[PDB]
Motif scaffolding. Structure first.
Motif, short mmCIF file in Angstrom:
data_model
loop_
_atom_site.label_atom_id
_atom_site.label_comp_id
_atom_site.label_asym_id
_atom_site.label_seq_id
_atom_site.Cartn_x
_atom_site.Cartn_y
_atom_site.Cartn_z
N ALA A 33 52.29 -34.19 12.95
CA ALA A 33 50.84 -34.03 13.08
C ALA A 33 50.25 -34.08 11.68
CB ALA A 33 50.52 -32.72 13.75
N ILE A 72 47.46 -32.21 5.43
CA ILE A 72 48.55 -31.27 5.68
C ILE A 72 49.41 -31.84 6.82
CG2 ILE A 72 49.22 -28.93 6.31
CD1 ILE A 72 46.51 -27.95 5.44
N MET A 77 54.23 -31.34 18.08
CA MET A 77 54.34 -30.44 19.23
C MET A 77 53.74 -31.18 20.43
SD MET A 77 55.68 -27.60 17.83
CE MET A 77 55.36 -26.28 19.00
C1 LIG Z 1 49.49 -33.93 21.41
O1 LIG Z 1 48.76 -32.70 21.49
C2 LIG Z 1 48.44 -32.04 20.34
C3 LIG Z 1 49.44 -31.76 19.42
C4 LIG Z 1 49.14 -31.06 18.25
C5 LIG Z 1 47.83 -30.65 17.98
C6 LIG Z 1 46.83 -30.92 18.90
C7 LIG Z 1 47.12 -31.61 20.09
N1 LIG Z 1 46.13 -31.91 21.04
S1 LIG Z 1 44.96 -30.83 21.51
C8 LIG Z 1 43.66 -30.95 20.25
O2 LIG Z 1 45.59 -29.55 21.48
O3 LIG Z 1 44.48 -31.36 22.74
C9 LIG Z 1 47.86 -29.94 16.64
C10 LIG Z 1 49.30 -30.04 16.17
C11 LIG Z 1 50.20 -29.72 15.13
N2 LIG Z 1 49.93 -29.07 13.93
C12 LIG Z 1 48.53 -28.96 13.51
C13 LIG Z 1 48.46 -28.41 12.11
C14 LIG Z 1 48.56 -29.29 11.02
C15 LIG Z 1 48.74 -30.78 11.17
C16 LIG Z 1 48.49 -28.79 9.73
C17 LIG Z 1 48.32 -27.43 9.51
C18 LIG Z 1 48.23 -26.57 10.59
C19 LIG Z 1 48.30 -27.04 11.89
C20 LIG Z 1 48.19 -26.03 13.00
N3 LIG Z 1 51.38 -30.16 15.46
N4 LIG Z 1 51.27 -30.76 16.70
C21 LIG Z 1 50.00 -30.67 17.13
#
Ligand SMILES: COc1cc2c(cc1NS(C)(=O)=O)=CC1=C(NCc3c(C)cccc3C)N=NC=21
Length: 243
Positions: A33, A72, A77
């Motif tokens: 991500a 970042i 996930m």
């Molecule tokens: C496919 O589905 C998803 C998957 C992810 C996701 C959102 C969705 N879709 S939704 C909007 O929920 O509909 C956000 C992340 C993530 N990390 C995010 C993160 C980053 C990159 C940097 C620093 C802190 C954080 C928390 N790893 N995987 C997923």
């Protein structure tokens, strides 16, 4: 930074997830991500200190940062945010799966407790679910009244025991299949009712043993509430008893 600095040439943007965060590939093989950053340099550098110094199987893992432009990069996930994962009725969860979602978060929180780190916003919306259905807490860095004990709402007294409270509400969220806590009350009515000793009802899918565990997180006296280590043992016991 150091080894944490990722060369942005090695990132491939494949799809937009939400708001901005995008799904991608890192060095070809690794699913990631990618968050496009809004926030100051002091506020970023402090959020970097947390992510780089905390690491556990049930915490969303940082892979790196691009700070010479800013991105970042983290563990991907596949099943997205926990709240929406719960709400999708196609899954049709067995209650053992729900208890194991609670155990995952509890393991993360027991780790954070061991490092004396306060999460301060534990809720289903801030948890993410990978392709195997493993739930992980976002440590990364509208007051969450419905997730707050009375000592936070009245006095802003945050401690390990206010995370415990929140975790209890998180369990309820899981066992209610992602309903809003106190869904028929406003935030103001919720704060009043919890001051009068009212607590969340037992969701239908929650057994008496599971409900006792989540209810122990909501004792009026903060020092009567368990640690995350105690909660983990109780969850493990129930898993062995009820399955
Ligand atoms: C496919 O589905 C998803 C998957 C992810 C996701 C959102 C969705 N879709 S939704 C909007 O929920 O509909 C956000 C992340 C993530 N990390 C995010 C993160 C980053 C990159 C940097 C620093 C802190 C954080 C928390 N790893 N995987 C997923």
């Amino acid at each position: 930074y150091g080894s944490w600095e990722i060369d942005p040439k090695d990132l491939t943007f494949l799809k937009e997830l939400g708001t901005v965060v995008k799904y991608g590939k890192w060095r070809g093989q690794y699913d990631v991500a990618i968050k496009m950053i809004s926030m100051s340099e002091d506020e970023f550098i402090e959020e970097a200190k947390v992510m780089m110094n905390l690491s556990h199987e049930k915490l969303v893992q940082l892979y790196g940062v691009c700070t010479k432009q800013i991105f970042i990069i983290t563990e991907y996930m596949a099943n997205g945010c926990l709240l929406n994962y719960l709400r999708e009725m196609r899954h049709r969860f067995q209650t053992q799966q729900l208890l194991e979602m609670c155990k995952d978060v509890c393991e993360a929180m027991e780790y954070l407790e061991s490092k004396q780190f306060l999460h301060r916003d534990l809720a289903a919306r801030n948890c993410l679910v990978n392709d195997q259905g493993v739930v992980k807490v976002s440590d990364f860095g509208k007051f969450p009244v419905r997730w707050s004990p009375p000592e936070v709402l009245m006095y802003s007294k945050f401690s390990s025991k206010s995370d415990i409270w929140a975790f209890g509400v998180l369990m309820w969220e899981i066992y209610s299949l992602g309903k809003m806590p106190y869904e028929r009350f406003t935030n103001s009515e919720t704060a009043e009712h919890i001051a009068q000793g009212l607590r969340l009802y037992r969701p239908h899918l929650a057994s008496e043993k599971v409900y006792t565990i989540m209810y122990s997180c909501w004792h009026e006296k903060a020092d009567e509430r368990p640690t995350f280590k105690i909660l983990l043992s109780n969850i493990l016991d129930v898993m062995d008893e009820e399955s």
